[PDB]
Amino acid sequence: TMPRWVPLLLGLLGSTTCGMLLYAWSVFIKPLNAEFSRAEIAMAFAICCLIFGLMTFPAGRLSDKMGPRKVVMTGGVLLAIGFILSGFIQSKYQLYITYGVIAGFGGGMIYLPPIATAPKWWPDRRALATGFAVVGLGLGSFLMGPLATYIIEWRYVFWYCGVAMGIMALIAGAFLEPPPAGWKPAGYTAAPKVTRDWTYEEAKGDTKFWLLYLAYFCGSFAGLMVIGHLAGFGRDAGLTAMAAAGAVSSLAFSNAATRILSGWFVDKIGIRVYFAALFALQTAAMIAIFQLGGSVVGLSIVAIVIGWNYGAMFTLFPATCLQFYGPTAQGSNYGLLFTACGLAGFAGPWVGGWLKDTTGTYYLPFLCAAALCALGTAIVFMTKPPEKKHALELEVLFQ
Ligand SMILES: O=C(O)c1ccc2ccccc2c1O
Structure with missing residues (x-):
């Protein structure tokens, strides 16, 4: 098997990718206005949140049915594609699609399956394990914002960050799967009532x-x-x-x-x-x-x-x-x-x-x-x- 702290690391990776996705629009506000409104840009972020939050549901269902690995790795592909395509946009709707839907779609599919899987490895500490699956959404600003800022002085952010995020998500999904159905990782712990x-x-x-x-x-x-x-x-x-x-x-x-x-x-x-x-x-x-x-x-x-x-x-x-x-x-x-x-x-x-x-x-x-x-x-x-x-x-x- 694998040391049960690995899924914590994986969920950290996936959630950090998701944080970068949700934080990017703020670094993109000024560039997009310079070439062409803050609210117009913000509609892209809201579309992203909507798609992300909805696509968790199919992502959860598919994770439960056919395992979480396929789900997170598909999400990595979808997000990488969507973000990377945002660099080639030439209109507002182009961005709505590339960032709002494709990237949001991939993001939801990355976000959820680890949230479900990590506690399965930590029955003694379920909430902490969950926290590791969700903590990356706090961090994305910290790692990325400086790096994304470093790049523009903007499309380079989209393309290169899309690549790095896809790699992180594919690695996270690559090693992700529940414990074996029978044996649960532990060191400890007439007719019954099951x-x-x-x-x-x-x-x-x-x-x-x-x-x-x-x-x-x-x-x-x-x-x-x-x-x-x-x-x-x-x-x-x-x-x-x-x-x-x-x-x-x-x-x-x-x-x-x-x-x-x-x-x-x-x-x-x-x-x-x-x-x-x-x-x-x-x-x-x-x-x-x-x-x-x-x-x-x-x-x-x-x-x-x-x-x-x-x-x-x-x-x-x-x-x-x-x-x-x-x-x-x-x-x-x-x-x-x-x-x-x-x-x-x-x-x-x-x-x-x-x-x-x-x-x-x-x-x-x-x-x-x-x-x-x-x-x-x-x-x-x-x-x-x-x-x-x-x-x-x-x-x-x-x-
Ligand atoms: O905090 C987070 O982990 C998180 C993740 C996804 C979200 C999707 C839509 C709106 C808010 C979100 C949010 O706050």
Whole structure:
């Protein structure tokens, strides 16, 4: 076999590729305007989020059916193709297709299968393993942004980064597969009562799946609706652009770190209460920005918290889903669940911009984000796991 820490490395690789994909548009804003609108460019990012978040669902299903390796490597090919084709674009729709759909398609197919597979190697520590599958989305900015910046002084970014990302994803998918069906990597641990994981049709039909879905949409939407406004709130309060941006930049560090730390923490003490507390904290942050946000230090504290809570979602929801329905159907269960996040990624940033511009003030978007997080707090706290499924058909084998 292989040392079970390898899948952690693989998910790190794949998730880092996905982070580079989701971060690239920000480095591409100014070049594309110079040759030819920020909103026009941004529609490419929103299309990308939509396709990514939707394509996790087919990616999860196909991973569950025909294994995760084929899925991630196809995704690597699709992403490499789409990104690389963005270099040859000559119009806006060219970019919508190359980056928004092909690259988003490949990205979703890379993102999901490791998220499902890594915990299968770590039943003693499921949430930490998941965090390794999702931590790369924090890092992509750090490795790439400097490198992508180094290149333009822009098409070279698309082509060369597309190649490097394809290589990383193909390597990640090349070595990815669940443990052997029978023997689970361990060092430790009349007629019985045999339980079993949930089927995708059973999980999909469960009411708690959709409470979790709703909560996922709410939190995803809140964060995505206000994060882009953090620095503007600062500058609006009287800070220099340099100061405001410096402050908001701490968010990336917390968004990356929480993914591992929260995973480890709930592995140790359980999920529900920590998770609900994070949502509450996010709620309070949406409100508190109106008192802290006018100073580099205050604005930084809010950005760090917003980042901490936001990022935690992408470990804790898959971990929660794993607790409720088990790992055998996790490709399907969590892929369906992640589509909420695909939708929020599509609409949330736009809606936040619209509310601010509509009122000219930040009260509306931050208050709406606070309410969404409040509902999420409620759902996450109130929702306890369903009853473990009885496998009467294996139960009857005991004579
Ligand atoms: O944080 C992440 O891991 C992540 C991954 C994929 C996403 C797709 C659409 C919108 C937000 C996403 C997101 O926040």
